[PDB]
Design a protein around this nucleic acid. Structure first.
Ligand code: MG
Length: 228
DNA sequence: CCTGTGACAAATTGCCCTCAG
DNA sequence: CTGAGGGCAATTTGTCACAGGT
DNA sequence: ATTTTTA
């Protein structure tokens, strides 16, 4: 049995997406990525791109009060305006219409229809993971890294991944100061590895690769907790 | 050029409180 | 009661000066 | 439900 179907996980929603989206350049908050997980699930459960979110189900899934769930949704929704996702040279807006609330506790969004082929009809070159794996992660760049690791994950839960550092900076859109490699180490790399090791079922180590005086790549290795 | 760390600026966390319906 | 508002201190993330080649 | 990518 593959760990995607392990008994403790199987009941959580299966999030699935093309590797082009896993590799795309975009910048979303934790809260925005949490809602996008719910949109992809909904879309795949049956599409014109019009989706829904209930405050009450959001609070239940992420372990929040009703009031904070309402705050998270309202502010993340407004901040979606003007956000674009760039595939690799090809930019699309996430939303083609502002969000609105038809009735108390309910919100309605229109996801760009040109993005729907990135979430359905996948036969290969896709990324998969259970929502329960990511819902305790806090830092949004730790969410980006976890999805990239998942992209090379074998059915048994393990894998290895080399990632060029210039590429990480471009596609995750890290802030300016993380071009200085000691800041990249202390505020992105160590922080995100610690989050994955303590909030997911993945167990992760890494080694730096150098060319001359420059560090150019990180090489990641990992195994699943249910195999240990 | 490269490294780590102290410090300070700005953003984000989970909580708290009020009230309409 | 929920959930749509208003707020908080604690805590993390983003930036840079400095010391020094470990 | 599933698979093709790093190097
Ligand atoms: Mg919040």
């Amino acid at each position: 049995t593959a760990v995607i179907n392990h008994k403790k996980r199987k009941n959580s929603p299966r999030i699935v997406q093309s590797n082009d989206l896993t590799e795309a350049a975009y910048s979303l908050s934790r809260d925005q990525k949490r809602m996008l997980y719910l949109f992809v699930d909904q879309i795949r459960k049956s599409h014109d791109g019009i989706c829904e979110i209930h405050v009450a189900k959001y609070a239940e899934i992420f372990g929040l009060t009703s009031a904070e769930a309402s705050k998270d949704i309202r502010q993340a929704l407004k901040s979606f305006a003007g956000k674009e996702v760039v595939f690799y040279y090809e930019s699309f807006p996430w939303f083609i219409k502002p969000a609105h609330s038809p009735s108390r506790g309910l919100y309605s969004v229109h996801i760009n229809p040109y993005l729907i082929p990135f979430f359905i009809g996948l036969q290969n070159r896709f990324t998969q993971f259970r929502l329960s794996e990511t819902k305790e992660i806090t830092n949004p760049y730790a969410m980006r890294l976890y999805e990239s690791l998942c992209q090379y994950r074998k059915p048994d839960g393990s894998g290895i991944v080399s990632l060029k550092i210039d590429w990480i900076i471009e596609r995750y859109q890290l802030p300016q100061s993380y071009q200085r490699m000691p800041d990249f180490r202390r505020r992105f790399l160590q922080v995100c590895v610690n989050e994955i090791n303590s909030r997911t079922p993945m167990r992760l180590s890494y080694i730096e690769k150098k060319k001359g005086r420059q560090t150019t790549h990180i090489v990641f290795s990992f195994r699943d907790i249910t195999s240990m």
